[PDB]
Amino acid sequence: GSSGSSGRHVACLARSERGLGFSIAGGKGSTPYRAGDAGIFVSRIAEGGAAHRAGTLQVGDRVLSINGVDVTEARHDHAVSLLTAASPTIALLLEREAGSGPSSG
């Protein structure tokens, strides 16, 4: 029958002064990636790069935490404070929601 069970994963990439690769959207100090959503989701991803090559990153996934910090309802700038951080590693808790939700049918 039907069964919808999401799953949270971990994404690790090497940040660089040139620019990690992927971007964020939704933050309070930014545009609501999703009408009615005050969180943070991937707006862009660096193709053939780190965020992309990774595999566990896709434009849409919401960022629950960042570098061991709950940023579910964190402000845009707030969340960045962790991303913009000068660290060779960046752990992002992404939540993969099981779509398969056929509205029409």
Nearest to 42 by CA among 19, 27, 61: 61
- Domains of the chain with bracketed CATH: 5-105 (2.30.42.10)
Which DSSP string corresponds to the chain? ------EEEEEEE---TT--S-EEE--TTS--SSTT--S-EEEE--TTSHHHHHSS--TT-EEEEESS-B-TT--HHHHHHHHTS--S-EEEEEEE------S--
Cα–Cα separations (whole angstroms), residue 78 to 22, 67, 89: 17, 13, 18
Identify how the structure was determined: NMR
By the 8 A CB rule, do 26 and 75 touch? no
Q: What is the dihedral of CA 15, 66, 21, 50, to 10 degrees?
A: 70
Determine the Cα–Cα distance for residues 15 and 17; give it in Å rounded to an integer: 7
